[PDB]
Amino acid sequence: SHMEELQNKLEDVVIDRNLLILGKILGEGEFGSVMEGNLKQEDGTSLKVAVKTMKLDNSSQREIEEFLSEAACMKDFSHPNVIRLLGVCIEGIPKPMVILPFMKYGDLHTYLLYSRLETGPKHIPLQTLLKFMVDIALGMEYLSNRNFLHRDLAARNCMLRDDMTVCVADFGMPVKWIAIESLADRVYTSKSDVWAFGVTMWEIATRGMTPYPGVQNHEMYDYLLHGHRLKQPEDCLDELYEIMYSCWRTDPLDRPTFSVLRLQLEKLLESLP
Numbered sequence: 001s002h003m004e005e006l007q008n009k010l011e012d013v014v015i016d017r018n019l020l021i022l023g024k025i026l027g028e029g030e031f032g033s034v035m036e037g038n039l040k041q042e043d044g045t046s047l048k049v050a051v052k053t054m055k056l057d058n059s060s061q062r063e064i065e066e067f068l069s070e071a072a073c074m075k076d077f078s079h080p081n082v083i084r085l086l087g088v089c090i091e092g093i094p095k096p097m098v099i100l101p102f103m104k105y106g107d108l109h110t111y112l113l114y115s116r117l118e119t120g121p122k123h124i125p126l127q128t129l130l131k132f133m134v135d136i137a138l139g140m141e142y143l144s145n146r147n148f149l150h151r152d153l154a155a156r157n158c159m160l161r162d163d164m165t166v167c168v169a170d171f172g173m174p175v176k177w178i179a180i181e182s183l184a185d186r187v188y189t190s191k192s193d194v195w196a197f198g199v200t201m202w203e204i205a206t207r208g209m210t211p212y213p214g215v216q217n218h219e220m221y222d223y224l225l226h227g228h229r230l231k232q233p234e235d236c237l238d239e240l241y242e243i244m245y246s247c248w249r250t251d252p253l254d255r256p257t258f259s260v261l262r263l264q265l266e267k268l269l270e271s272l273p
């Protein structure tokens with residue numbers, strides 16, 4: 001029970017409820033519906049937002065405190081490839097809410113899949129795909145430098161802005177993104193995120209394939225213990241494959257840092273005409 005600590009932590013990002021106008025439902029999240037909205041800002045402008053709400057039921061003091069912890073966890077993230085907290089509404093209503101920026105094109109996984117259909121985005125070029133990987137690496141570099149562990153890094157948790165920038169986030173199958181040492185023990189480090197980053201790169205390069213076709217979830221641990229890894233996609237440059245492969249080295253200490261991955265990815269992207 002840390003409700004007093006949490007309210008003091010979130011004080012300077014509290015927002016007046018009446019500045020916010022809610023709109024339609026975007027979907028369901030951990031604690032309830034996610035609405036789109038408009039938020040009138042301090043300087044006088046307007047901003048299209050996503051508003052995370054809590055279910056109408058009497059959700060416990062623990063759920064409320066868990067909800068606000070997540071916001072407090074995000075509060076100081078300031079980076080263009082990391083989702084940012086716009087603020088919170090508490091003290092005017094029975095369930096509080098968290099205000100986030102609107103991500104026009106939604107989650108990256110669904111976007112990759114829609115790009116293979118005529119009606120959605122068009123065919124994504126190789127350079128744009130690489131740029132998505134770069135953005136994610138930039139975001140993860142920032143987070144791992146702050147000692148934040150993601151733990152569920154995947155294309156489905158990455159979000160696309162109006163200008164096609166990727167933001168790392170968590171919405172709140174998954175065995176297939178988990179590093180070998182994290183399956184084997186409870187161990188998570190930044191190097192476990194590196195592994196999940198490699199899988200996300202492979203998702204991006206395959207334009208949204210589920211990792212490890214023909215391997216079922218309950219077979220995964222054994223498959224990885226035998227040293228087997230994701231195969232090279234048919235259209236994937238050898239250099240790009242070498243980069244994703246380095247993310248799955250059995251010893252976490254041998255995997256590259258996010259800085260190194262990001263440098264390697266920028267170099268490959270800039271190497272293309």
Ligand SMILES: Cc1ccc(C(=O)Nc2ccc(Oc3cc4cnn(C)c4cc3-c3cn[nH]c3)c(F)c2)c(=O)n1-c1ccc(F)cc1
Pocket residue numbers: 026027028029034050051052070071073074082083098100101102103104106143150168169170171
């Ligand atoms: C640490 C932390 C705490 C809390 C969060 C969080 O609350 N994120 C979060 C994310 C998405 C959410 O949903 C949507 C938001 C938008 C915006 N635009 N559009 C169109 C949307 C549609 C939906 C939607 C929901 N259902 N269906 C669709 C949502 F409600 C909450 C978070 O991400 N992190 C974090 C974790 C790891 C990092 F690297 C960085 C930050």
Ligand SMILES: [Cl-]
Pocket residue numbers: 080082083084101167
């Ligand atoms: Cl953002």
Ligand SMILES: [Cl-]
Pocket residue numbers: 207208209210
């Ligand atoms: Cl597919």
Ligand SMILES: [Cl-]
Pocket residue numbers: 211212213229230231
């Ligand atoms: Cl595979």
